[PDB]
Swiss-Prot record, chains A, C:
Belongs to the helicase family. RecQ subfamily. Disruption phenotype: Increased sensitivity to UV light and recombination deficient in a recBC sbeB background, partially resistant to thymineless death. Increased genetic instability of G-quadruplex DNA; a double recG-recQ deletion shows 10-fold increased genetic instability. It comes from Escherichia coli (strain K12). An ATP-dependent DNA helicase which unwinds DNA in a 3'-5' direction. ATPase activity is stimulated by single-stranded (ss)DNA but only very poorly by double-stranded (ds)DNA. Binds to and unwinds a wide variety of substrates including 3- and 4-way junctions (including Holliday junctions, HJ), flayed duplexes, 5'- and 3'-overhangs and blunt end duplexes. HJ DNA unwinding is stimulated by single-stranded binding protein (SSB). Unwinds G-quadruplex DNA. Unlike yeast SGS1 or human BLM, is equally active on dsDNA versus G-quadruplex substrates. The chain holds residues 531 to 606 of 609 of the full protein. The gene is recQ. Limited proteoloysis experiments show there is a large N-terminal domain with ATPase/helicase functions and a non-essential C-terminal domain (HRDC). The N-terminal 21 residues are required for helicase and ATPase activity, the C-terminal HRDC domain is required for stable DNA-binding but not ATPase or helicase activity. Has 5 structural subdomains; the first 2 (residues 1-208 and 209-340) are the conserved helicase domains which abut and form a deep cleft that probably binds ATP and ssDNA. Induction: By mitomycin C and UV irradiation under the regulation of the SOS system. This is ATP-dependent DNA helicase RecQ.
Length: 76, 77, 76
């Protein structure tokens, strides 16, 4: 598990939710973020196996989240 | 006694999943089940099935996210 | 998308946001930066084609981002 990545995921979700003017959970719930911080999905397929992530959420939110995880793992 | 911090997390997760699916919160898990989860902190399929109000159907449908939340809590993650 | 450009775009965004005392997303959101990294817009018209880039933001933040992208694509 990566705690630093989890904090980064929470911050991204907050940014998207604030800009979109929706409660953070409407973007993703905490369990989805935890799995992301565990599985560290970097591809579309990897993202779609994370619970809470359907094709709808993948199109709207997928790129920023994948990019964040990729950058964290690559050490940027 | 149950972990009140975990119960409140489970409550928020349930609200999120229930709102998503457009069902009453109890249709996911009722309050008594959540409290039992906050008491027993189930982390595997077997442990979840030991909890009142959790059968194989609910485990299939809702199990993963709740287990992920409990596992992260018990590890302080 | 170009990952090294995306990194550079994030750094410029952070610098503008820090100076302005705003969260980075308020300058441009993550998805907008990713599209810039994808399409590498150099002209004003190309920049305006990017989601989340209106004329107001262009006047305010446009020139530094255009200069950055151009210097990246050319090897400056």
């Amino acid at each position: 598990y990566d705690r630093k990545l989890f904090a980064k995921l929470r911050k991204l979700r907050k940014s998207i939710a604030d800009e979109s003017n929706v409660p953070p959970y409407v973007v993703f719930n905490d369990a989805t973020l935890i799995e992301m911080a565990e599985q560290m999905p970097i591809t579309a397929s990897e993202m779609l196996s994370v619970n809470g992530v359907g094709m709808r959420k993948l199109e709207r939110f997928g790129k920023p989240f994948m990019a964040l995880i990729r950058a964290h793992v690559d050490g940027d």
